[model samples]
Target: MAQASVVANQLIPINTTLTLVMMRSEVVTPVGIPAEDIPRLVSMQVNRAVPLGTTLMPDMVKGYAA
Candidate 1:
């Protein structure tokens, strides 16, 4: 089976909401679920200012992903 493509390249502003969806099912894609209903794979709030050139680590934000 072919794996879903993963792309991460964006400069989000502070307090911006981010959602990470995992496409696992072969028949269902990421867009299968509604944007509002799609489970909150991960949700968090920016606590501090992140530099322009900085990598985002798991510990950087507080969120949970299934």
Candidate 2:
């Protein structure tokens, strides 16, 4: 069987909060920084597409960093 795929390319205006329920294999790419490594308390451009069965939260906003 072939796996399904989803793609999203939307523009987020200034001073707006983008929220969604992420799913498996979903990807969120930020314009300024890596989606999984955004800084806290800072506003940056982000493009996200979540997979099936996923949740959105503030912590998810700031991705992990090494």
Candidate 3:
């Protein structure tokens, strides 16, 4: 899944919004999946501290810290 692009002189500015959009789209999708299942997806990698086997509470992260 390699991304190909060209950098022609004066064709596009550097560090502009358009360039950033091109980079983001290569990863993000228009219709994204649920946040919870996102980590489980092959394309998306979940963090180890996501509390996969724990409860699904909003303060789960805070509780884990205590």
Candidate 4:
């Protein structure tokens, strides 16, 4: 399995990346499960890493054809 955001487990079991995103920072997409995040993560998504509260994107679910 291709390893991505260590927090992949946190995105409600969904995974995507658009295969490309901003490194220093990223833009949020308009999707229910992404761009915006759920409760717990909102609190801890400080200075980042994937598992470290990366922005969820609809294109995050890699491997799946979009």
What lDDT would each prediction earn against the true structure?
A: 0.38, 0.31, 0.23, 0.31
**Candidate 4 collision pairs:** 7-51, 15-60, 15-61, 16-60, 16-61, 17-59, 17-60
Best by lDDT: 1
Worst 10 residues of 2 by lDDT: 1-10
Candidate 1, pairs of clashing residues: none
| lDDT tens readout by residue for model 2, 7-63 | 222333333344331212234432222234222313432335323333333433333
Q: What lDDT score is found at residue 15 in candidate 1? A: 65
lDDT of 4: 0.31
For 1-66, candidate 3 gives per-residue lDDT tens digits of 233211111222222222211111122222222233322332222122322122222231221211
Give the C-alpha miss distance for residue 33 in model 3, angstroms. 0.5
Off by over 4 Å in 1: 1-8, 21-41, 49-53, 63-66
Off by over 4 Å in 4: 1-51, 63-66
Error of 1 at 31 (Å): 30
Writing each residue's lDDT as its tens digit, candidate 4 over 2-56 gives 2232233332322223222222232333322332233323322222234434544
For residue 18, what is the lDDT in candidate 3?
21
